[PDB]
Amino acid sequence: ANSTLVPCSKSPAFQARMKNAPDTYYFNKPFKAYAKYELCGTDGLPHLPLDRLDRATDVLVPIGLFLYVAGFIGWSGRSYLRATKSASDPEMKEIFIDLPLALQSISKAVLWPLLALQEFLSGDLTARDEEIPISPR
Amino acid sequence: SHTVKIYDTCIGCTQCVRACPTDVLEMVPWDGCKAAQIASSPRTEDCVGCKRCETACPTDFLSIRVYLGAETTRSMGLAY
Amino acid sequence: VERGSKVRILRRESYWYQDVGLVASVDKSGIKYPVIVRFDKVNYAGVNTNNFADFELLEIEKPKA
Amino acid sequence: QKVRVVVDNDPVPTSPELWAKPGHFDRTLARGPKTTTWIWNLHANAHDFDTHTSDLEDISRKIFAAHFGHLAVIFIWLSGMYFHGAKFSNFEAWMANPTGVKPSAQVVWSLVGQDILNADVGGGFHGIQITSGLFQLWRAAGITNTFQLYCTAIGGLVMAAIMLFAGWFHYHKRAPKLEWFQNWEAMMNHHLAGLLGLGCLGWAGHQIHVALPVNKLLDAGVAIKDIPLPHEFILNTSLMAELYPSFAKGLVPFFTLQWGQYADFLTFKGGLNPVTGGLWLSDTAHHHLALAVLFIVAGHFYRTNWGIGHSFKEMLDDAKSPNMLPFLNFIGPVGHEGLDKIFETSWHANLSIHLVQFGTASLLVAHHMYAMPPYPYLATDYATALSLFTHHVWIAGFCIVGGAAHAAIFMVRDYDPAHHVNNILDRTLRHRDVIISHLAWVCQFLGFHSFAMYCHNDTMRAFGRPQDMFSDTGIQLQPIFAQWIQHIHTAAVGALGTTAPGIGAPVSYAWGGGMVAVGGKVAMMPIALGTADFLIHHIHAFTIHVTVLVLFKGVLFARGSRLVPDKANLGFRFPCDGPGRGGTCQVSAWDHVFLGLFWMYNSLSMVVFHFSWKMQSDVWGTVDSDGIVTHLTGGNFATSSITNNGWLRDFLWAQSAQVIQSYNSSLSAYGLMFLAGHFIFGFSLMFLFSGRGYWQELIESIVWAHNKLKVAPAIQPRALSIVHGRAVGVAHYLLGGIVTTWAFFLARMSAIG
Amino acid sequence: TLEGQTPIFGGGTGGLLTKAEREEKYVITWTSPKEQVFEMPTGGSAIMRQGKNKLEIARKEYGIALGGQQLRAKFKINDYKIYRVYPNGETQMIHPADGVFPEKVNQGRPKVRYVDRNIGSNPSPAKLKFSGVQPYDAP
Amino acid sequence: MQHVFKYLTLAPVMATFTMVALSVVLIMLQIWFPGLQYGTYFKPTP
Ligand code: F6C
Ligand code: CLA
Ligand code: CLA
Ligand code: CLA
Numbered sequence A: 001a002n003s004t005l006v007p008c009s010k011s012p013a014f015q016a017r018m019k020n021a022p023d024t025y026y027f028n029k030p031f032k033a034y035a036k037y038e039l040c041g042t043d044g045l046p047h048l049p050l051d052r053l054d055r056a057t058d059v060l061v062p063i064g065l066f067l068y069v070a071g072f073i074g075w076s077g078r079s080y081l082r083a084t085k086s087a088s089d090p091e092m093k094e095i096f097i098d099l100p101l102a103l104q105s106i107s108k109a110v111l112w113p114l115l116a117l118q119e120f121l122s123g124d125l126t127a128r129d130e131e132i133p134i135s136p137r
Numbered sequence B: 001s002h003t004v005k006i007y008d009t010c011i012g013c014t015q016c017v018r019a020c021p022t023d024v025l026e027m028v029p030w031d032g033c034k035a036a037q038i039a040s041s042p043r044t045e046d047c048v049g050c051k052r053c054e055t056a057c058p059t060d061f062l063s064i065r066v067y068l069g070a071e072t073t074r075s076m077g078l079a080y
Numbered sequence C: 001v002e003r004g005s006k007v008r009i010l011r012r013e014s015y016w017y018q019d020v021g022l023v024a025s026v027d028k029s030g031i032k033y034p035v036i037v038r039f040d041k042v043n044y045a046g047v048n049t050n051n052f053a054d055f056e057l058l059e060i061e062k063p064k065a
Numbered sequence D: 001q002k003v004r005v006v007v008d009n010d011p012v013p014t015s016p017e018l019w020a021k022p023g024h025f026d027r028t029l030a031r032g033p034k035t036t037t038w039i040w041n042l043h044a045n046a047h048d049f050d051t052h053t054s055d056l057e058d059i060s061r062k063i064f065a066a067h068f069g070h071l072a073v074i075f076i077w078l079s080g081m082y083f084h085g086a087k088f089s090n091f092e093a094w095m096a097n098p099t100g101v102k103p104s105a106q107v108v109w110s111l112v113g114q115d116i117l118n119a120d121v122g123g124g125f126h127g128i129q130i131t132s133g134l135f136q137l138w139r140a141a142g143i144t145n146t147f148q149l150y151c152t153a154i155g156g157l158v159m160a161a162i163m164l165f166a167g168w169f170h171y172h173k174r175a176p177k178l179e180w181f182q183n184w185e186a187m188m189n190h191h192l193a194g195l196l197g198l199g200c201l202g203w204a205g206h207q208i209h210v211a212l213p214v215n216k217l218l219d220a221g222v223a224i225k226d227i228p229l230p231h232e233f234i235l236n237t238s239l240m241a242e243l244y245p246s247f248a249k250g251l252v253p254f255f256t257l258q259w260g261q262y263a264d265f266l267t268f269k270g271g272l273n274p275v276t277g278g279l280w281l282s283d284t285a286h287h288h289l290a291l292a293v294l295f296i297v298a299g300h301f302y303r304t305n306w307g308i309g310h311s312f313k314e315m316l317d318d319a320k321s322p323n324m325l326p327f328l329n330f331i332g333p334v335g336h337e338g339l340d341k342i343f344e345t346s347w348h349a350n351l352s353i354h355l356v357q358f359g360t361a362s363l364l365v366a367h368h369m370y371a372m373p374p375y376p377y378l379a380t381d382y383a384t385a386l387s388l389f390t391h392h393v394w395i396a397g398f399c400i401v402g403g404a405a406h407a408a409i410f411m412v413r414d415y416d417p418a419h420h421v422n423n424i425l426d427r428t429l430r431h432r433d434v435i436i437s438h439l440a441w442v443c444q445f446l447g448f449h450s451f452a453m454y455c456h457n458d459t460m461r462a463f464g465r466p467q468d469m470f471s472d473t474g475i476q477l478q479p480i481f482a483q484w485i486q487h488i489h490t491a492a493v494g495a496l497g498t499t500a501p502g503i504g505a506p507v508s509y510a511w512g513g514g515m516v517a518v519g520g521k522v523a524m525m526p527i528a529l530g531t532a533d534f535l536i537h538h539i540h541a542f543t544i545h546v547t548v549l550v551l552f553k554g555v556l557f558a559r560g561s562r563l564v565p566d567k568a569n570l571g572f573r574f575p576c577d578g579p580g581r582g583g584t585c586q587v588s589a590w591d592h593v594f595l596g597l598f599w600m601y602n603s604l605s606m607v608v609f610h611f612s613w614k615m616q617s618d619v620w621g622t623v624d625s626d627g628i629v630t631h632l633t634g635g636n637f638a639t640s641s642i643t644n645n646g647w648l649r650d651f652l653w654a655q656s657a658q659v660i661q662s663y664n665s666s667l668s669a670y671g672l673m674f675l676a677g678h679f680i681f682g683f684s685l686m687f688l689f690s691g692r693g694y695w696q697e698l699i700e701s702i703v704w705a706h707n708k709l710k711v712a713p714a715i716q717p718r719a720l721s722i723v724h725g726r727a728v729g730v731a732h733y734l735l736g737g738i739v740t741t742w743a744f745f746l747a748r749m750s751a752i753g
Numbered sequence E: 001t002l003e004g005q006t007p008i009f010g011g012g013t014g015g016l017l018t019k020a021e022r023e024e025k026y027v028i029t030w031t032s033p034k035e036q037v038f039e040m041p042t043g044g045s046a047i048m049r050q051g052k053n054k055l056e057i058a059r060k061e062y063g064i065a066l067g068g069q070q071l072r073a074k075f076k077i078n079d080y081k082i083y084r085v086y087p088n089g090e091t092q093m094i095h096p097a098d099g100v101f102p103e104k105v106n107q108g109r110p111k112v113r114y115v116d117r118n119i120g121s122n123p124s125p126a127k128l129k130f131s132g133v134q135p136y137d138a139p
Numbered sequence F: 001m002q003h004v005f006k007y008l009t010l011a012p013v014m015a016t017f018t019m020v021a022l023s024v025v026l027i028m029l030q031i032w033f034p035g036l037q038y039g040t041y042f043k044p045t046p
């Protein structure tokens, strides 16, 4: 077990940092949260270790949240781009946002992981190598 | 001097000859294209290498190619 | 190929290599590159049309009707 | 009859249809985007009106409407400044205690700890210390409360709305003909007598009736609440009589040419007010009245409609051999004949001249404002003085570069060889080789005999041979001519004998005659010049001459050169003419402007560094009860500035302690901006050092990656064009460097100022 | 010798240099319907006379630019010729080569430096190592 | 007015609106819940 990291509430340097702080909105409750939940090094500052079986939700929750949001944005963009390909003037739809199409793309991308899995299973996710422009070797 | 080559993809659009600032190219009779003419570079000694002909060429890829070679007084564009 | 057909370019140095174009006209004379193909996307020179021979094209869709 | 008003009625309908048609002004851009280069082209050609259409009249109408729009923008900015000074400032507390309160007019919200930037500026106020000098300006104008600032802000908003409506009206409703814009004589008369003259007269009236009495009461020490409102100074003539006895005699002395009785409020003192350190407001009132009279007189010089006056065309046509001076007849038998067509047809030449003169005006503003501080408590507000000088120097440099650029644009586009046959422009173009060769030689001479001498000083100091250095204690280089000018200007007022007896105090204390202190700090004192000043002034001469070399080579060779004879056909802005002729990279005049931007940045950075170091070392400081002055850097400039190791250590390294140690304090934003400017400079380095082919091939690979996932865009991604890459590089370079210097200066002078 | 009167020009610094007298020089001759102002290739404005005009220039590009972009495009003059003059007095008429402008196809002109293939079929340089032939010159 | 609506759908206008909305959301999150850190999100205030 890692011994150089101890809970912040038991770190003398972190306690000194807490006492020496300004008394504003930005410091009181954040320090209470850091003392209760964070692990502090010898410098008295919170450190984020990835070596604990416990507090694994503290790692997976932000990672999963960001992955969901990024996949949502990417799937919305991809679905909108694929929907604009069938149009006669797709560039005009890329400089002029087609609101119903964008709303439909966002609504569908709300469930982006399942749609991506289905597209990968059916081969719709990727185009074959021989239908993609390439440079001479 | 530079080397100017013309490949069989030329469509005889005469744009490269018009673009040349030193009269290196000219149009000669041909039968490989609808225009019945092809570009030629009989005066490559006067070529400066500006590659204006390549810019003017509409084919893909280029039907006229300029390969920079040994530098002379006139290929460096020197008035002195 | 003929007018209205969809083709895939097989010319290696072409900007539209392995891309899709539409045949606009075929020249019946004995010129080297009789087929004229137009493309939706322009190349680096801003040109969206080119001349190809038959062996440099792969038909992927017959002309409508 | 010749000068008359002619307009077209409803030439352009007011419809938002073209708002949904981006690039409508350009034939190429009207078809829509095919690659990402279309967006950059749309933004780059937005205001290039002469490429939208070939009709000069429509171009001029566009110029007029756009100028109204820019005036509206300026009015909005001024209204914002006044409103922030009225609502989120400590202006009243500062007016109560000018010498003990830091001006502040920006307050930040408290969300992410940025409220630490609310510095304790005195007067019970927490905010960002401003360095714009707005408080001193408002105090000099007689403003004493925030209500007047609020009223001025409302008036500024109203003026902005009026300017916007004027632009709309004069473009879409009543558009003047081309003949209207070509009235040189009427325009000059109206802008000399009506704009400068009447504005000077109005400001002199405001000063005499409002600013002088209020500021006299303020300097007398009476409180703000006991000072009556400005209108009371007009209604109650008894207050005028008490403050200035001559006002008891009304307007009689003015109309009888007995103006000498007005000397109590129209003074000619010179020097500075001992109480505040700024110029006497009565001195400035007389100055502005004299300017008003002179400008109104100048506004009757040109012939408009009554035969009286001078003609531009006749005067230009007469200026040629043999009508010139005997040694000035080399301009040839044509001379200035033919130049009138340039002003008939070319907006770009006028823009070039006016940008050059705006640069001149801003340089004069910076110099004459630090040397003769015109506002109360401005000289002793060191941060404000440094900020004003640096800001106006930079504005002047940018204006000069723009003047050169638009001169090159005129040469490429509007120049007509038929109009200039053996005239002065033609002869200049025909000996451009002489001009450029001599300029290059003098640039080399200046570079050697300034910077190589600095390197010589470095090497001699490293050897431990100070006696061999160019210094006051070694091989001296005394600027004897500048010292002589200082002595003459000091002796002129009585402080080549007494050539200006009417001025009591020295015109500027920087030339000599004494020292002025206000709040225990030096306002102005004589600025001695030695070997270091000689060296730095010749450094300035070298940098300016090289910038001139770059810009003037660009302008003179814009049409073409021995390398590319047909550059005019290629245009003002093109990347190259191919790798041939050995390589013709950056031959266009635009690239010469691009390089001149860098050289102007170098020159002006040295100018502002010289100003900052010399002011901190030999002028600014604190004065004790005994009159002994201790300066901010303790006289480093004489011995440390003669080597660039001295510049590196005692100026860059030593004076950056404030910005570098500003974390966890109210100046931490300055340290953040210091790092940000360094980052932006480093970032610009890649746009400057690389080429677009590499980026295009990398984008090819990335586009393959996007195509594999069916997410490629129809608007095909393209690397920036060569010219676009150069522009991005120079813009980010200048931004990073200027922001770095700005943060450095402002942090240091907010901490120790 | 070449006949024609030089255009009215007061002098300039973009004229001939040592290369003109040491290595080679060029002369552009033409005929105009009237006296009119044109632009010199190296800066400045000159006046071409009504008769036949002759102008000395340092590079062939100067003459090509003057003949094409100014004489034909602007003044509608099509009879201009460009000669190359050597220091020993030998003169060759080099433009147009055969009396017909190069942009117009003319019978009898041979194909020079023509490659009987598309540009993508050039052999790789590894084929021609130590053989001294470039891929574009390969048969 | 339809031209104004079409103008409002331009890529720069929509991008500015989206960035402004996201910035407002993030700013309000900072104001309401300052000092959020990894290992602290969605945890009760002590
Ligand atoms: C990558 C990198 C990085 C990272 C990673 O991760 C980060 C993170 C962090 C964290 C941890 C925190 C919190 C969290 C939250 O919020 O949480 C809630 C939410 C949720 C839960 C969720 C949310 C979600 C969302 C809403 C979604 C959406 C998003 C979008 C898309 C974005 C985009 C948009 C735009 C921007 C507009 C923070 C914060 C801070 N910041 Mg920091 N970041 C960074 C960056 C940056 C930069 C550049 C700068 C400069 C500007 C800064 C600044 C700052 C300040 C001032 C401050 C404060 O105050 C805070 C605090 O307190 O601390 C502690 N920093 N951060
Ligand atoms: C005395 C008459 C007069 C005055 C004061 C002006 C003033 C101005 N002209 Mg102008 N002009 C005049 C006559 C006059 N013109 C005539 C007769 C012609 C035709 C030959 C022109 C043709 C002309 C052109 C073609 C252009 C100008 C432009 C400008 C502006 C230059 C920018 C500047 O310095 O900002 C000064 C900043 C200010 C805030 C000044 C105040 C602005 C308002 C409009 C002044 C109103 C004064 C009025 C008497 C009301 C006063 C009320 C009370 C105080 C007494 C400036 C506002 C340029 C411009 O920007 O156009 C918009 C421009 O491109 N003028
Ligand atoms: C009275 C002032 C004035 C006026 C009216 C003009 C007018 C004009 N200039 Mg000009 N210019 C000026 C001053 C002026 N200039 C100055 C002072 C300089 C020196 C820097 C230049 C340098 C210059 C060049 C080099 C060129 C022009 C060009 C042009 C023409 C096209 C305008 C254009 O491209 O839109 C401007 C469009 C843009 C996209 C520019 C905006 C981008 C800027 C650089 C951002 C600046 C950063 C910002 C201030 C700070 C950071 C922001 C933050 C978000 C980080 C037009 C006739 C161009 C032309 O073709 O002329 C015929 C051209 O090539 N000018
Ligand atoms: C539709 C949105 C979208 C999607 C799904 C992707 C997807 C991808 N991009 Mg990509 N990209 C995009 C937009 C997008 N890009 C834009 C707009 C740019 C220009 C800034 C780039 C520039 C770019 C580069 C330079 C690289 C990728 C790479 C990649 C691949 C892995 C890394 C990654 O996710 O990008 C990370 C994301 C970025 C680098 C920037 C994208 C962020 C933009 C601003 C979001 C735009 C959202 C859009 C406006 C939504 C509108 C939809 C609405 C109308 C409904 C992946 C295939 C990499 C690759 O080839 O991997 C193999 C790579 O090197 N992209």
Ligand code: CLA
Pocket: D140, D141, D195, D196, D197, D198, D199, D200, D203, D279, D284, D287, D291, D357, D358, D360, D361, D364, D365, D368, D369, D374, D375
């Ligand atoms: C020679 C011109 C001149 C000078 C020296 C001054 C000097 C002064 N003015 Mg003033 N002013 C002027 C003209 C001038 N003014 C004009 C024309 C107007 C409008 C009609 C005003 C309106 C005005 C207001 C509203 C205020 C001042 C104030 C002040 C004082 C503050 C310092 C300052 O403005 O910078 C000094 C400026 C300079 C040293 C140079 C700028 C002057 C012009 C731009 C020079 C132009 C010459 C040009 C480069 C060459 C043209 C080309 C050539 C062919 C002719 C100071 C005493 C303020 C005050 O009350 O003081 C306490 C104030 O609030 N002025």
Ligand code: CLA
Pocket: D439, D440, D441, D443, D444, D445, D446, D447, D448, D451, D452, D455, D546, D549, D550, D595, D598, D599
């Ligand atoms: C510190 C870096 C540096 C230096 C030393 C130079 C030096 C020079 N630049 Mg330059 N330049 C630079 C950065 C630099 N540049 C950058 C970053 C840019 C991008 C904007 C440019 C852009 C630029 C342009 C656009 C132009 C110049 C020009 C010049 C020359 C000006 C004439 C001169 O001063 O001659 C004197 C030479 C020096 C002062 C160089 C230092 C000499 C040392 C101190 C003494 C050497 C002693 C001895 C000879 C050594 C011999 C020993 C042996 C073993 C070698 C000169 C060669 C101009 C030019 O060509 O002028 C005609 C010009 O047009 N430069």
Ligand SMILES: CC1=C(/C=C/C(C)=C/C=C/C(C)=C/C=C/C=C(C)/C=C/C=C(C)/C=C/C2=C(C)CCCC2(C)C)C(C)(C)CCC1
Pocket: D074, D078, D194, D195, D198, D199, D200, D202, D203
């Ligand atoms: C530099 C600059 C600036 C500004 C400045 C200023 C502040 C200026 C001013 C100006 C001015 C300040 C002007 C003025 C003008 C005026 C005028 C124009 C007037 C006129 C008047 C009149 C016309 C009158 C009339 C009358 C009446 C009403 C009644 C009775 C009769 C008589 C006639 C007397 C800024 C910073 C913003 C920005 C940058 C640049």
Ligand SMILES: CC1=C(/C=C/C(C)=C/C=C/C(C)=C\C=C\C=C(C)\C=C\C=C(C)\C=C\C2=C(C)CCCC2(C)C)C(C)(C)CCC1
Pocket: A050, A059, A070, A071, A072, A073, A074, A075, A078, A112, A116, D709, D711
């Ligand atoms: C445990 C963990 C970790 C680690 C991890 C790892 C190591 C991972 C790996 C991973 C991997 C190894 C991966 C791979 C992948 C592959 C691929 C191949 C992919 C692909 C993708 C795609 C295809 C996508 C698509 C999409 C989507 C879905 C959405 C949006 C749009 C798009 C289109 C983009 C860490 C420490 C960090 C943190 C904590 C936890």
Ligand SMILES: CC1=C(C/C=C(\C)CCC[C@H](C)CCC[C@H](C)CCCC(C)C)C(=O)c2ccccc2C1=O
Pocket: D686, D687, D688, D690, D691, D692, D695, D696, D718, D719, D720, D721, D722, D724, D725, D726
């Ligand atoms: C880096 C570089 C490029 C690549 C740069 C390109 C293609 C421009 C990319 C611009 C982007 C797309 C603008 C947007 C960037 C913003 C940071 C995105 C903000 C996103 C928000 C969600 C925050 C060139 O094309 C180039 C060309 C010629 C000389 C030098 C260079 C050069 O140095």
